[PDB]
Amino acid sequence: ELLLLYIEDLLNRCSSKSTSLFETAWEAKAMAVIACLSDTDLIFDAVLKIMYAAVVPWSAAVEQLVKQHLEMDHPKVKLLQESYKLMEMKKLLRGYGIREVNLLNKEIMRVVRYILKQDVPSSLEDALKVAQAFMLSDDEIYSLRIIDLIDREQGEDCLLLLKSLPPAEAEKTAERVIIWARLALQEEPDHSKEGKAWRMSVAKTSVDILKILCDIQKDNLQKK
C-alpha cells in the first residue's frame, strides 16, 4: 500500500505541474517499485493509475509496460483494455483539439459534428467510436452523415452508405432523414438558384431512399 502511495505521489509531483513532457524521472523510479510489489492485484491497478495520470500518448518505457501488462491474464486486464481504449479516444480528442478528459454527456454530439466538419476520410469512423464509448446510438451518426452529404448534394454517397449499412439501423436513419427533409422543405422557399437546386436534390435523394425503405419494410404491414 505504501509503495502504491509512493507511486501516486511521484505521479502527482510530476504530471500535475508538467509543463514540458520530459520529466520522465517518475517512470524509471516507478518501474522498480512495480518490481517490488508482491500482490498481483496491486500491480495492475498501479499500472492503471500510471495510465490515468500519464499524458496520452505515453513514452517508450510506458509503452513497453503497457504491452507487457497486456500479455498476462488477470480479471483487471479487462479494465486495462478499457483504459487502453480510453487512451485511444483521448488520443483522438487531443488530435482534434479537445483535451478535456471525460466530457460528461452533452458535448458528444458537438464533438461528432466537429469531427464530421474536418472532412477526414476516417472522420465518420472517428465520430462512430465517440458515440460508441459514450453509449449513444449509431442512428444519429449516420443520420447526420447523410444530412451533411445532402447539404453538399452528394446523395450517391448517401445511397452507398445506406446500402453498406445493415437494414436495422438503415430503417432508423432513413425515417429520421425523411422527417428532417420534410421539415426542411416546410419552411419558406428560396428564390435563388442554389435554393431551388437544393430542394430538387433533397427530393431526388428522398425518392430513392424511400423506395429502398419500401423494399426493406415489405413484411411490416403497419409501416408498409
Binding site: 483539439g97 479537445i98 478535456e100 458535448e107 458537438r110 459534428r113 466537429y114 466538419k117
Partner: protein, 98 residues
C-alpha cells in the same frame, strides 16, 4: 433649510452632452462586443464548444446589466429632454437614436 439642493445638482450637472455621447458610444461598442461574442459562440456551440459553458452565464449577466444600462440611460435622457425642450432637444435626440 434654505436652498441646499441647488448645489447638489451641480455635482450631477457635470454630465455634459459630450459625456452623454461618450456613454452612447460606450454602450454601442459594448453592444458590438456582445454581438461579436455571440457570433463567435454560435460557431462554438455548433462546431467547437469546450471553454464557453460558464461564458454562457457570463453572457446572461452582461446582457442583463447592459439592458439595465440602456434603460437607465434612456430614463436619464428623457428626464432632461422635458426640461430643456428648446435648447437641448436636437443633440439629445441624435444620441437617443443610437
Amino acid at each position: 433649510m434654505a436652498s441646499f439642493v441647488t448645489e447638489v445638482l451641480a455635482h450631477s450637472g457635470r454630465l455634459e452632452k459630450e459625456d452623454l455621447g461618450t456613454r452612447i458610444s460606450r454602450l454601442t461598442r459594448r453592444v458590438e462586443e456582445i454581438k461579436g461574442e455571440v457570433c463567435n459562440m454560435i460557431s462554438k456551440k455548433y462546431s467547437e464548444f469546450l471553454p464557453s459553458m460558464q461564458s454562457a452565464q457570463g453572457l446572461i449577466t452582461q446582457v442583463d446589466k447592459l439592458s439595465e444600462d440602456i434603460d437607465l440611460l434612456k430614463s436619464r435622457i428623457e428626464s432632461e429632454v422635458r426640461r430643456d425642450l428648446h435648447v437641448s432637444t436636437g443633440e439629445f435626440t441624435d444620441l437617443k437614436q443610437q
